[PDB]
Coordinates of C-alpha atoms (C1' of nucleotides) in Angstrom, one line a residue:
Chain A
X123 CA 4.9 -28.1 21.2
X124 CA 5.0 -28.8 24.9
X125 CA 4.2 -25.1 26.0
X126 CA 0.9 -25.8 23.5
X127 CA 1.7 -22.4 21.2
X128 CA 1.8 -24.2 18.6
X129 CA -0.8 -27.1 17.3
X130 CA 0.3 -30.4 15.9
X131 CA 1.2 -29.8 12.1
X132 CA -0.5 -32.3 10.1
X133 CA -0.3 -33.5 6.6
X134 CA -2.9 -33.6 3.7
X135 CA -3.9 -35.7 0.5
X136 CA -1.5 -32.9 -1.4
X137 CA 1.8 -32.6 0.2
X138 CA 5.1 -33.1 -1.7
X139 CA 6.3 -36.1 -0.7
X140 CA 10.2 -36.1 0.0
X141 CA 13.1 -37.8 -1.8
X142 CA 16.9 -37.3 -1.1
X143 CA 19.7 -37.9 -3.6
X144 CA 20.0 -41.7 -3.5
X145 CA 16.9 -41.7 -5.3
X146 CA 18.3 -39.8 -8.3
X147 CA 20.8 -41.3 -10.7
X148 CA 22.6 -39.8 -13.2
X149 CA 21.8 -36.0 -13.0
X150 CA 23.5 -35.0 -16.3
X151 CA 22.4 -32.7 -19.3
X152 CA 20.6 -34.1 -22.6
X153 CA 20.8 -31.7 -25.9
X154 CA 19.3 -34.3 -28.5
X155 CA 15.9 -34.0 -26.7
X156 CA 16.4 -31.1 -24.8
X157 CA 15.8 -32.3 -21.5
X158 CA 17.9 -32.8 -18.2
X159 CA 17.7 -36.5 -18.1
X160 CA 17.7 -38.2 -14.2
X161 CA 16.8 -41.8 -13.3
X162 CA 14.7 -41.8 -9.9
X163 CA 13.8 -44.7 -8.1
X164 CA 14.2 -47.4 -11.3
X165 CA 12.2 -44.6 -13.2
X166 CA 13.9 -42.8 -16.5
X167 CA 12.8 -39.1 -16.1
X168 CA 12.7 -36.5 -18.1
X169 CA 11.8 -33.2 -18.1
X170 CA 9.7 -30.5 -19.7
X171 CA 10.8 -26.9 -18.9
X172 CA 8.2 -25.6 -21.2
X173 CA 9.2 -21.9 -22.1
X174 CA 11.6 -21.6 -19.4
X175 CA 13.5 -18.5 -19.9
X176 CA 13.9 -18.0 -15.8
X177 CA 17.3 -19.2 -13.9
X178 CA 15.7 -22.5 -13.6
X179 CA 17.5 -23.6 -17.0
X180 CA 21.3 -21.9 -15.4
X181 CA 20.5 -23.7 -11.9
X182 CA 19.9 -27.3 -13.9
X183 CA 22.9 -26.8 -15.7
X184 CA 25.2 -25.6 -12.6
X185 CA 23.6 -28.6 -11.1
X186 CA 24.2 -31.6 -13.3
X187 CA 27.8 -30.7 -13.9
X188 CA 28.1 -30.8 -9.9
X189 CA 28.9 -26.7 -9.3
X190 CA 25.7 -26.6 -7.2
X191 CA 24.9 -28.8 -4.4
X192 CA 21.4 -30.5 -4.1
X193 CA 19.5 -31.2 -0.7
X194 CA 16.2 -33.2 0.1
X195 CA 14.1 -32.2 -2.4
X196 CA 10.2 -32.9 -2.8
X197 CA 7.9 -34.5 -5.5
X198 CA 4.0 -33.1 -6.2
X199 CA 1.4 -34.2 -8.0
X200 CA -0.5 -31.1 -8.6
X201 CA -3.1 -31.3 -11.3
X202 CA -1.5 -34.3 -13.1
X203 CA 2.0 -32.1 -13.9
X204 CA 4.1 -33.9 -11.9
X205 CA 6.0 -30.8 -10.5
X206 CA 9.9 -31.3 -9.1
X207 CA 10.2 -28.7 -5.8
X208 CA 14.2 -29.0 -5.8
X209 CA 16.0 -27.6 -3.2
X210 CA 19.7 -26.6 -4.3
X211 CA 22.4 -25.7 -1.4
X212 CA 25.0 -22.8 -3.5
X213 CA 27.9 -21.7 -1.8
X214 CA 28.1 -17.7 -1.8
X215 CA 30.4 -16.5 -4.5
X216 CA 33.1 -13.8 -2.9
X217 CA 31.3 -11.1 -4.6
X218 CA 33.9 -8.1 -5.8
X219 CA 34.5 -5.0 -8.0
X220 CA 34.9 -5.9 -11.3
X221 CA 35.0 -2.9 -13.7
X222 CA 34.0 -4.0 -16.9
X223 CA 29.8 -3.4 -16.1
X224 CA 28.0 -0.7 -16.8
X225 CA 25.2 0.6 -14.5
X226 CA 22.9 3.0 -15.6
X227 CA 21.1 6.0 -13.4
X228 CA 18.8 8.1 -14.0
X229 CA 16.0 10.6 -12.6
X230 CA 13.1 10.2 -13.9
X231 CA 9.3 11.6 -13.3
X232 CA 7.1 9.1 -10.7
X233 CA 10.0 6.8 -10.4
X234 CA 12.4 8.4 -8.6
X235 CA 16.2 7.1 -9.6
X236 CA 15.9 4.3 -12.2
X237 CA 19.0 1.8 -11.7
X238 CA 19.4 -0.2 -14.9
X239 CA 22.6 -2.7 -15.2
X240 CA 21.9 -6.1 -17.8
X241 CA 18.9 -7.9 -17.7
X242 CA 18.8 -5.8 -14.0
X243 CA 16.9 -2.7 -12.9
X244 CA 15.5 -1.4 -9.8
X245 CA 14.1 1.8 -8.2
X246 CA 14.9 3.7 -5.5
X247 CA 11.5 4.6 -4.2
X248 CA 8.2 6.4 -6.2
X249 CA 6.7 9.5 -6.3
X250 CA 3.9 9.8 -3.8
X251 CA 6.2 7.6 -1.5
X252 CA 8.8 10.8 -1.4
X253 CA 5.7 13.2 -1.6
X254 CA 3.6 11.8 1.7
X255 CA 6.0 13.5 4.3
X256 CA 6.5 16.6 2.4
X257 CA 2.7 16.8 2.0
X258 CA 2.4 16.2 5.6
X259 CA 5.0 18.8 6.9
X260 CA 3.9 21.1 4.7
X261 CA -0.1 20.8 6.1
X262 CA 0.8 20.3 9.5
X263 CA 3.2 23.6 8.8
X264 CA 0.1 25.5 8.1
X265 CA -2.0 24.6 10.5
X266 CA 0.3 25.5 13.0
X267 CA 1.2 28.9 11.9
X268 CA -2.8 29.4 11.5
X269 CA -3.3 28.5 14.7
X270 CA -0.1 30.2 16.5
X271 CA -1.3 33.5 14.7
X272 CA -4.5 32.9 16.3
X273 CA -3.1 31.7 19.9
X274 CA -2.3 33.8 22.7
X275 CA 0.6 36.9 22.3
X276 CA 2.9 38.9 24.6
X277 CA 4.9 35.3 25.7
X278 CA 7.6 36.5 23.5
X279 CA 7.5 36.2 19.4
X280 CA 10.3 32.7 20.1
X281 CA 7.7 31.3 22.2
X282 CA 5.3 31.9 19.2
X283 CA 7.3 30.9 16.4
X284 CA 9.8 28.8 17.3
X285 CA 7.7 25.6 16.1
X286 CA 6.8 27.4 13.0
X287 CA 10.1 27.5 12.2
X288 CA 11.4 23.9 13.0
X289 CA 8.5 22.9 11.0
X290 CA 9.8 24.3 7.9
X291 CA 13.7 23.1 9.8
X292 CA 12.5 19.8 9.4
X293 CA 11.9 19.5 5.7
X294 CA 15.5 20.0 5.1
X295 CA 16.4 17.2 7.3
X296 CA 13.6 15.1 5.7
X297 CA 15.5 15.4 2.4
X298 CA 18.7 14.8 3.3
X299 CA 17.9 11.6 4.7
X300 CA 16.3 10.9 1.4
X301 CA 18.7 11.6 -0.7
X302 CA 21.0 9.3 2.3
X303 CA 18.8 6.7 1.8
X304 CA 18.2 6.7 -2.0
X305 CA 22.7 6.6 -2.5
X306 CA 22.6 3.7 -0.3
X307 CA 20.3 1.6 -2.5
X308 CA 21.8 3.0 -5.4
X309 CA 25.4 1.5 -4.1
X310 CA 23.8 -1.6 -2.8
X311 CA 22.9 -2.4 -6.3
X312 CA 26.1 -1.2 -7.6
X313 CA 27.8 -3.7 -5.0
X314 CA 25.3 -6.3 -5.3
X315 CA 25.1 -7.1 -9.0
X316 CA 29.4 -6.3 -9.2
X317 CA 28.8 -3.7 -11.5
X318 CA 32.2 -1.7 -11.5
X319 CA 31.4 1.4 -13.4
X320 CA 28.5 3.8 -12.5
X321 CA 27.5 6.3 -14.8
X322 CA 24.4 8.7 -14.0
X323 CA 22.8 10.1 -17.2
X324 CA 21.7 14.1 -17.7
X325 CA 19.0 13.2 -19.6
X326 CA 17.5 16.6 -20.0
X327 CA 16.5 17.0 -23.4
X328 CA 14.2 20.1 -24.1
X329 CA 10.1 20.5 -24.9
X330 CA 8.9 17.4 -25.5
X331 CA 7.6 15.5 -22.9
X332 CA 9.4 17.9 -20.0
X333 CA 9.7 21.7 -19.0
X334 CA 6.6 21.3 -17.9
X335 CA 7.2 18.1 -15.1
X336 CA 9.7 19.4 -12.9
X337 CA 10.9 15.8 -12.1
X338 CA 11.0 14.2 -8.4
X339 CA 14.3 15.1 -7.1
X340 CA 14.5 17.5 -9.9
X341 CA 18.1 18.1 -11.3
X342 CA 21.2 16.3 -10.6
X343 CA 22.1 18.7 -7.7
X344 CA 19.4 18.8 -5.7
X345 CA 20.0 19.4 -2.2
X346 CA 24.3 17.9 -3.3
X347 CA 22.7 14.7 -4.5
X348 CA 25.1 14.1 -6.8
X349 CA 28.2 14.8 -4.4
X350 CA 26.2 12.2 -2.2
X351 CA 26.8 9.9 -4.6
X352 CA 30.1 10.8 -4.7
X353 CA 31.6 11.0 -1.7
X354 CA 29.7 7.4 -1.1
X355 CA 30.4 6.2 -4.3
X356 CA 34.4 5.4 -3.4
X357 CA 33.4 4.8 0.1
X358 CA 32.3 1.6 -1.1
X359 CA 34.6 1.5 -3.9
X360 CA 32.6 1.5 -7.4
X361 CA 33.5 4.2 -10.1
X362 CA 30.3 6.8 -10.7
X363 CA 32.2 9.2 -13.2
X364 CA 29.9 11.6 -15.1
X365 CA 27.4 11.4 -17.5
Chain B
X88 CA -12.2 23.1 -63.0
X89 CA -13.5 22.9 -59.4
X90 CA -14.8 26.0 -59.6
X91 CA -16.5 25.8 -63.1
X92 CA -18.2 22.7 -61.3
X93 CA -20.0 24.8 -59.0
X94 CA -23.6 26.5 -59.7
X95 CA -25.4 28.9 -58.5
X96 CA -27.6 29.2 -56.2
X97 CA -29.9 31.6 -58.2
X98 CA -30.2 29.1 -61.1
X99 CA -33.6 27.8 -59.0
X100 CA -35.8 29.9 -58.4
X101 CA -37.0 30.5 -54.7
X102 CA -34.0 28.2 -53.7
X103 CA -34.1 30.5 -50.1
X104 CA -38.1 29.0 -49.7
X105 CA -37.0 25.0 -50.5
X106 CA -33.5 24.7 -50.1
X107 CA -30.4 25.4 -47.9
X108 CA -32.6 23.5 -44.8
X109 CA -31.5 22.2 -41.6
X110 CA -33.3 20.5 -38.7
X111 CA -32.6 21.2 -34.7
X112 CA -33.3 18.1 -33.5
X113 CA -30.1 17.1 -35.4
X114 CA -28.2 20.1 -33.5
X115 CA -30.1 19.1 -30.0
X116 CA -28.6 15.1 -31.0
X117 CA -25.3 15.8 -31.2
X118 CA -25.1 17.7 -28.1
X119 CA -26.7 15.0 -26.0
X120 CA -23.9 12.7 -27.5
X121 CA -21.4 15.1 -26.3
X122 CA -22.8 15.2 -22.9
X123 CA -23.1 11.4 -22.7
X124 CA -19.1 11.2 -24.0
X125 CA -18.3 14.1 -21.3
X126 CA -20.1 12.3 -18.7
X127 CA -18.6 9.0 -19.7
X128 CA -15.0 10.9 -19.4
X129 CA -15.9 11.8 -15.9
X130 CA -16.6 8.2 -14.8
X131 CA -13.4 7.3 -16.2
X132 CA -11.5 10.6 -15.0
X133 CA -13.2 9.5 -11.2
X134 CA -12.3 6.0 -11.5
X135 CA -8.8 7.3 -12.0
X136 CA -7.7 7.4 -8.1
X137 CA -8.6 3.9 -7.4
X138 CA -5.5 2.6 -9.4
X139 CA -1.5 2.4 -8.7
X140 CA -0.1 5.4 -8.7
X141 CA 2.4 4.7 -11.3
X142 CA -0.3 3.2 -13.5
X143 CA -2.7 7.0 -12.9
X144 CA 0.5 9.0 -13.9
X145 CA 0.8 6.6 -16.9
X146 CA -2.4 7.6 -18.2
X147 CA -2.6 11.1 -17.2
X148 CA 0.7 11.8 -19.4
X149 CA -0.7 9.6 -21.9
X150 CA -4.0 12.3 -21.6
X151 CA -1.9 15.4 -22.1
X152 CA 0.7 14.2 -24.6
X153 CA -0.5 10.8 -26.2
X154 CA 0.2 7.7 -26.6
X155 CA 3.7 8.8 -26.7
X156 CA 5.5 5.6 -25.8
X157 CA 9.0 6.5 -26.5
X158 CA 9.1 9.9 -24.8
X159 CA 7.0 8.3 -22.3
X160 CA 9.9 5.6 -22.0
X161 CA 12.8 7.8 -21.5
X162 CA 10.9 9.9 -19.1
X163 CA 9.9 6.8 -17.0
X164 CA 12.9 4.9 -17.2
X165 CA 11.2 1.8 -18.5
X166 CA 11.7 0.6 -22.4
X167 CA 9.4 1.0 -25.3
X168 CA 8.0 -2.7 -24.5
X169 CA 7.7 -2.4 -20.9
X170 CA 6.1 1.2 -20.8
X171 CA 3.6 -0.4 -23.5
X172 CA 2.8 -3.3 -21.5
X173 CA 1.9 -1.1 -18.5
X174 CA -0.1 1.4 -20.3
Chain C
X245 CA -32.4 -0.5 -6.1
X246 CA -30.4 -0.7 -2.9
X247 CA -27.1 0.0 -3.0
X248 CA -25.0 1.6 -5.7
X249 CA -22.0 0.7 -7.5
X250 CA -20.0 3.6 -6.4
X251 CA -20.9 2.9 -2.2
X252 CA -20.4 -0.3 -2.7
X253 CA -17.4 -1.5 -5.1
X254 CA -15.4 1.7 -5.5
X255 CA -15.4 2.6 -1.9
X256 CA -14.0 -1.3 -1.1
X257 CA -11.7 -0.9 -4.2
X258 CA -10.3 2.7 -2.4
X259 CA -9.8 1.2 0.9
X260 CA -7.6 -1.5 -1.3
X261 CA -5.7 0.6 -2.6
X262 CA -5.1 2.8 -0.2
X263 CA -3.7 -0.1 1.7
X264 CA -1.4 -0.9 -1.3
X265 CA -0.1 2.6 -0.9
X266 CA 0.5 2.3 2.3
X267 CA 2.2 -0.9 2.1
X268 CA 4.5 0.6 -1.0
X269 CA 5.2 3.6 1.2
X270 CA 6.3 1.9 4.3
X271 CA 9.3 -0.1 2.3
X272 CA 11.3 3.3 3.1
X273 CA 9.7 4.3 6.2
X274 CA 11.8 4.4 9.9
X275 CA 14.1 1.6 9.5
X276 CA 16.1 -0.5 11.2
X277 CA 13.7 -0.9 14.3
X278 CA 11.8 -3.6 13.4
X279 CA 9.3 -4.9 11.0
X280 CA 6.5 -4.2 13.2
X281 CA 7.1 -0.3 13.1
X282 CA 7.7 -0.7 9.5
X283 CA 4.2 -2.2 9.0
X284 CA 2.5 0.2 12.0
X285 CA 0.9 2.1 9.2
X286 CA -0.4 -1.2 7.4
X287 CA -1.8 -2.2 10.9
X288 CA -4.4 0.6 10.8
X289 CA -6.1 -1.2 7.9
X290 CA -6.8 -4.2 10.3
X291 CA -10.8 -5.1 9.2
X292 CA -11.3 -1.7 7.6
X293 CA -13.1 -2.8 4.4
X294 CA -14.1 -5.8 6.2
X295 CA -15.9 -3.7 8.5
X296 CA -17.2 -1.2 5.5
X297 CA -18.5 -4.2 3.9
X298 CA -19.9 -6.0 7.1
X299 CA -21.8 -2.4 7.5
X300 CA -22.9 -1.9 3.6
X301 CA -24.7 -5.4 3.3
X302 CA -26.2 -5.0 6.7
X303 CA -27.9 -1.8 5.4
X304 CA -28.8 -3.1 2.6
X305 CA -30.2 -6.6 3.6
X306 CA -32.6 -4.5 5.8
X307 CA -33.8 -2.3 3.5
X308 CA -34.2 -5.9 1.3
X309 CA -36.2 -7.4 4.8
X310 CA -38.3 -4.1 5.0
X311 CA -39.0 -3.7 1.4
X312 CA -40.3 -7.4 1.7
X313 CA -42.7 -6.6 4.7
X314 CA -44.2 -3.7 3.8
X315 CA -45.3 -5.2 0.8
X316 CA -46.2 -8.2 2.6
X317 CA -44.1 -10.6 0.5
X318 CA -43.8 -13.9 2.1
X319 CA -41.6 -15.6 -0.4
X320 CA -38.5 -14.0 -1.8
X321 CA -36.8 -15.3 -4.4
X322 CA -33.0 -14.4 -5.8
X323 CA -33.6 -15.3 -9.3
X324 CA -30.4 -16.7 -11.5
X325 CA -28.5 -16.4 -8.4
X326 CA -26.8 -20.3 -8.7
X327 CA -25.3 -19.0 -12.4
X328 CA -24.1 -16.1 -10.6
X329 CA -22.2 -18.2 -8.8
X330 CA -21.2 -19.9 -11.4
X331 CA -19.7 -17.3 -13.4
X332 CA -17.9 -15.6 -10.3
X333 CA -16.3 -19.0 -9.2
X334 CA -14.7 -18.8 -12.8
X335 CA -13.4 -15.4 -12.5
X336 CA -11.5 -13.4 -10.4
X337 CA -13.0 -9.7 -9.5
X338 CA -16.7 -11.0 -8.9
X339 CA -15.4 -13.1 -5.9
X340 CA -12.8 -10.7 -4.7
X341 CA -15.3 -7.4 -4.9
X342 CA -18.7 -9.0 -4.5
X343 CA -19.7 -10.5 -0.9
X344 CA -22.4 -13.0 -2.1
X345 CA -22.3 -15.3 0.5
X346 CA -22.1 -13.0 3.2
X347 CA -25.5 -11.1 1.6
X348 CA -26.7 -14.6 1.1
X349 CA -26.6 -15.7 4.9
X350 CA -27.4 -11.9 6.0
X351 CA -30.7 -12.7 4.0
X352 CA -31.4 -16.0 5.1
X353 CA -31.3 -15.5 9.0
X354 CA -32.9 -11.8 8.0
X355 CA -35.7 -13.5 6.8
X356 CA -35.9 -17.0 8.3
X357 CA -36.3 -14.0 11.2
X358 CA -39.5 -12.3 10.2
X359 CA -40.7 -15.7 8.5
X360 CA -40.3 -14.8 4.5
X361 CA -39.1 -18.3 2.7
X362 CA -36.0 -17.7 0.7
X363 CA -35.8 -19.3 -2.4
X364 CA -32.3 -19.7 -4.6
X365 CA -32.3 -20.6 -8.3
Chain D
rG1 C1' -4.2 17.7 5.3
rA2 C1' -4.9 12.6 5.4
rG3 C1' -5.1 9.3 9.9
rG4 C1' -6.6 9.3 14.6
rG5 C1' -8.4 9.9 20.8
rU6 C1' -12.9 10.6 24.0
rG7 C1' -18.7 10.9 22.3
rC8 C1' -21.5 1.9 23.8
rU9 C1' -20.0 -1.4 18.5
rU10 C1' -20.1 -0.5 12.9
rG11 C1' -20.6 3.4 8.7
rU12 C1' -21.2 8.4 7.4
rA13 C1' -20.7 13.2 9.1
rC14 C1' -20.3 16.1 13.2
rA15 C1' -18.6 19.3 17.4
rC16 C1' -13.2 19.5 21.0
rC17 C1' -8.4 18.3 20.5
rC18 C1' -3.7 15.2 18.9
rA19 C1' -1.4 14.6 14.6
rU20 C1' 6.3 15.8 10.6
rA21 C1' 2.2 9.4 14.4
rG22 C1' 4.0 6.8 6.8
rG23 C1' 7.2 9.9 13.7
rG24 C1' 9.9 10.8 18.5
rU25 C1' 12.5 7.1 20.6
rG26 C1' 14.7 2.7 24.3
rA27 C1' 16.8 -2.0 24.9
rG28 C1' 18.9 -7.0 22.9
rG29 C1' 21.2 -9.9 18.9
rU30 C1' 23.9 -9.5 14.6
rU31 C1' 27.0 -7.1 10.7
rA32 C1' 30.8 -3.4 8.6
rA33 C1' 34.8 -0.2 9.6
rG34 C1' 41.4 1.6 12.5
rA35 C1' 38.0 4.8 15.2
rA36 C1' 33.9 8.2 15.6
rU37 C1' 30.0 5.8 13.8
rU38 C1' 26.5 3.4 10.3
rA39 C1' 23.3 -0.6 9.4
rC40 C1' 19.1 -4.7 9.7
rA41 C1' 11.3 -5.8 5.8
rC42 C1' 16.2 -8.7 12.7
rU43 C1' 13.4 -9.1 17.8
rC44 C1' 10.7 -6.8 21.7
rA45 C1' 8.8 -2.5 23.7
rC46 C1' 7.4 2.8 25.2
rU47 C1' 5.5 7.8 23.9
rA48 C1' -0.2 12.5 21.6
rA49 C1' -5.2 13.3 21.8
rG50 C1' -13.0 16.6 24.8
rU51 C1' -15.0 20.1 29.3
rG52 C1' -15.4 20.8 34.5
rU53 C1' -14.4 19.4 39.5
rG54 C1' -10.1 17.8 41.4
rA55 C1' -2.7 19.8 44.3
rA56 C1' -2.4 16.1 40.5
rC57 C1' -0.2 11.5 34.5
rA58 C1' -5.9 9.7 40.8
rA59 C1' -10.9 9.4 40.6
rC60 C1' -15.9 11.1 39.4
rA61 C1' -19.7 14.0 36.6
rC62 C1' -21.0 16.0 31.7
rA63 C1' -20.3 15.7 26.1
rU64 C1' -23.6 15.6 18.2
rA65 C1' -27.2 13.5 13.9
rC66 C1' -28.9 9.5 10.7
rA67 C1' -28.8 4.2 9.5
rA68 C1' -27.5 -0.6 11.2
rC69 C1' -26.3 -3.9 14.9
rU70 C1' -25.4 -12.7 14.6
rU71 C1' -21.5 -12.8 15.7
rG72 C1' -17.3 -16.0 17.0
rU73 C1' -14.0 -20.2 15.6
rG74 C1' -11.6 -22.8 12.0
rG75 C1' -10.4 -24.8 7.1
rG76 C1' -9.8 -24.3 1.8
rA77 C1' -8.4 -20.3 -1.8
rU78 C1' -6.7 -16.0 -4.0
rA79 C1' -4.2 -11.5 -4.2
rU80 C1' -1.4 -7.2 -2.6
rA81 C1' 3.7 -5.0 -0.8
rC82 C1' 8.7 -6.7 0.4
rG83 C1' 13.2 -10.1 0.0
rC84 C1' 16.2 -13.8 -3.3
rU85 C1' 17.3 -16.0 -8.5

RNA sequence: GAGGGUGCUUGUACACCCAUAGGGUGAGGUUAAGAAUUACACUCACUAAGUGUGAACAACACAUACAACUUGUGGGAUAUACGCU
């Protein structure tokens, strides 16, 4: 404020006005109407969650029954919905192995490894994403043979080629930090969402839709990928067996 | 009985002067629709690149297999509803 | 006819999403020094289509102005233009792909310039 | 090969080069591990680019074609990629 970096932050006609906790009485659960039932401010309130298959009905729940903490929350007024912006303090859960989940990997064609566990799935990067450096090296590779081929000789064929070569050196390195990077994610999800057993499809089949795709990071060896997962996988503790 | 159903040809006489006709303007037609369904192909085929990636490879499979949402699915990684709902 | 379709809108939609693949690629790009060098490569597309479109409308406003005076037109008139409006208020691509207002002012000072009356309606 | 540097600004292309620049790194905070060490879409920052003269990473001179060239400041709004549930 004082060094003037920053202007005055004002209000407008649409801000959510705040409220703390004293203001709400009785947070607790109703089943007859369907509706988690408050009283704010000498008001009865209930709500209307609509089609609300999101967390919002599991927060509500861990809320009324007191698991989940509540802070200053906020009140708007947009469009005539009167819209509740709570604002729910949850203490962190010691999050640990527990091998009873299933998580499910697999390569696939422009979605590189496809991580599905639940109701949960993520990806570990996309096609053109793994294909823009490679593309690049592989240019940039040509370019610079064409023009050492064309540059001046009798320096010594090191001093003409020794760039040509790390060029093509470099890809390799490329990869394996790929292939680093990609494990990681895939054990950050396995550690994330406690998911205790790993299992990575072959998923191979024959005609149909592939032998003719060759599939980005191709088999399940590529460049040791799998022993990457490996040798990670019990280095953060999960159990990636076979599949 | 199909074949006892069929005439001949020679049963009218001159049937080569009168009959068995065909017009080229007909032939010229259905060219110049092709060419106006090629050329629409094109426009679609060039507006390709504009979109996601993931959305261009959805649709260039779906161009040299078909519509194939289950093989599409277990190639992608995505479910039967989900691999629908993008394409 | 100034302008086409395919200088106009698909050149503007490429620039898009070439900055969208840009943005997906640089999720996995050098890490762990920084946002900033993480999002170098969406830094190039600063005002790129901004600039593409800035240039695009000033061409074709001209060729609008010079059109107008060698023909010695000195009323111009955008005919349905306020429905226009209208309908891409209510929508979503016409606004986000189709600089009216900038052509609009272009036009106005264009021509409240050379002394043709702009008309809207 | 994208993308770029110099050729007043913008767009296209153009000569000359740089370009794994979606990379090569440096420091600070933090985290994890017995250690090596790893990590951060945590923060900040550095590094490539026409020809000649010129000791020079000094400075100066020279360096393609067409079109356009009223911007700047702010507010409201929407969407994209990422992170959490």
């Amino acid at each position: 404020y004082w060094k003037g970096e920053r202007s005055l932050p004002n209000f407008k006609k649409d801000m959510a006005f705040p409220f703390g906790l004293q203001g709400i009485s009785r947070l607790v659960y109703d089943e007859e109407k369907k509706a988690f039932c408050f009283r704010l401010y000498r008001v009865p309130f209930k709500t209307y969650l609509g089609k609300d298959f999101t967390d919002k009905r599991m927060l509500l729940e861990r809320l009324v029954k007191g698991d989940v903490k509540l802070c200053a929350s906020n009140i708007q007024l947009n469009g005539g919905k009167i819209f509740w912006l709570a604002v729910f303090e949850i203490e962190k859960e010691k999050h640990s192995l527990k091998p009873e989940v299933i998580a499910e990997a697999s390569l696939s064609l422009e979605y590189p490894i496809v991580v599905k566990t639940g109701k949960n799935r993520l990806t570990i990067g996309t096609k053109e994403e793994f294909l823009y450096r490679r593309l690049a090296i592989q240019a940039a590779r040509r370019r610079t043979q064409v023009g050492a081929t064309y540059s001046r000789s009798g320096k010594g064929k090191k001093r003409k080629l020794k760039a040509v070569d790390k060029y093509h050196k470099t890809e390799s390195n490329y990869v394996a930090h790929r292939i680093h990077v990609y494990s990681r994610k895939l054990i950050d999800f396995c550690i994330k969402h406690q998911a205790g057993t790993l299992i990575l499809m072959n998923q191979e089949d024959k005609v149909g839709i592939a032998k003719e795709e060759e599939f980005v990071l191709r088999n399940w060896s590529y460049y040791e990928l799998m022993t990457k997962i490996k040798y990670k996988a019990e280095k953060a503790g999960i159990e990636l067996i076979i599949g | 009985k199909f074949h006892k159903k069929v005439n001949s040809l020679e049963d009218y006489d001159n049937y080569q002067d009168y009959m068995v006709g065909y017009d080229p303007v007909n032939d010229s037609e259905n060219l110049d629709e092709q060419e106006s369904t090629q050329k629409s192909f094109d426009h679609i085929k060039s507006i390709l690149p504009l979109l996601n990636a993931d959305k261009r490879h959805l649709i260039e499979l779906c161009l040299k297999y078909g519509f194939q949402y289950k093989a599409i699915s277990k190639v992608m990684g995505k479910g039967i509803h989900e691999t629908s709902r993008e394409i």
